[PDB]
């Protein structure tokens, strides 16, 4: 039915007689689970010749899908991607159509143009080696890193972000914090409580980053990590995955990108692989960001703890989905799924 629906929308935009045909090129990830986005191929006729275009749909998930997040606003995702395209030179897919109602497919979705490129893999994590990024020269890896930090710096430099992105909304960090707490509560419902995360929320509250939270917020990409960027020749050609897009302190995106790589380094170490220890180091990332923006980042410590909580919410949702699909048993202790738990306990033992 998604291909049927896109074919119909194509019939309403292309010349009469184009007779578009739409098929699914890719609707699952490499483990056979439904993917975040679906790649479709559209074929039609124009002046006696075949035209073929790839399109990408993002569809909101239904309850029986075990969604990661408690609510979805695909309309906010679509508008940020559009505005980023308009206001900056950060490469993003061209948006084409949003169906906000859910009356057509069952749930809201939007369509974008396909961008060709490669992503540093999540499956297996790129720190496991045997992939284009891990196997590239150090120089090439650092070019990609620096270009990706540069894209982030550009996003964070959009003027008057609270006005321009007002649909996204005490401080912005306060409101984001309450949303993470709601995400945890949502996840608890599917898999059980984590005493660790509950003590961490208390820690986060009692060591609030007052200065960072008081400064002017910026547009936050959210899941700001190399796995969510398409590259060609080690340069970004599309920044993807705006699900966690927000307004907030710039430290949150920068801490997220650095910590995301540390979670994958930790998984690689558990696999007794050495990983990519020279990639996404805090010192290098802070130097690049600060040289590009002229803005001093607050200490990232709180934001790393905070990122750890959010990764744990993801793992709690992945865990629930895997039991729902019979793939695992509901774990004796949910914290077993948090392989960054030790990373987090060491951070919580520091004094900043
Ligand atoms: Ca542009
Ligand atoms: Ca200590
Ligand atoms: Mg992603
Ligand atoms: Mg996502």
Curated annotation (Swiss-Prot):
Pfam family, one: APH
Ligand binding (Mg(2+) 1): 228, 241
Binding site for ATP: 58, 113-115
InterPro entries, alphabetized: ACAD10_11_N, AGP_Transferase, Aminoglycoside_PTrfase, Kinase-like_dom_sf
Record has Magnesium as a keyword: yes
EC numbers, comma separated: 2.7.1.-
Enzyme active site: 223
GO biological process: response to antibiotic
Gene3D superfamilies: 3.90.1200.10, Phosphorylase Kinase, domain 1 (3.30.200.20)
Keyword terms, alphabetized: Antibiotic resistance, ATP-binding, Kinase, Magnesium, Metal-binding, Nucleotide-binding, Transferase
Annotated GO MF terms: ATP binding; kinase activity; metal ion binding
Binding site for Mg(2+) 2: 241, 243
Function in brief: Might catalyze the phosphorylation of aminoglycosides and confer aminoglycoside antibiotics resistance.
PANTHER family membership: AMINOGLYCOSIDE PHOSPHOTRANSFERASE DOMAIN-CONTAINING PROTEIN-RELATED, AMINOGLYCOSIDE PHOSPHOTRANSFERASE-RELATED-RELATED
UniProt-recorded name of the protein: Putative aminoglycoside phosphotransferase
Originating species: Mycobacterium tuberculosis (strain CDC 1551 / Oshkosh)
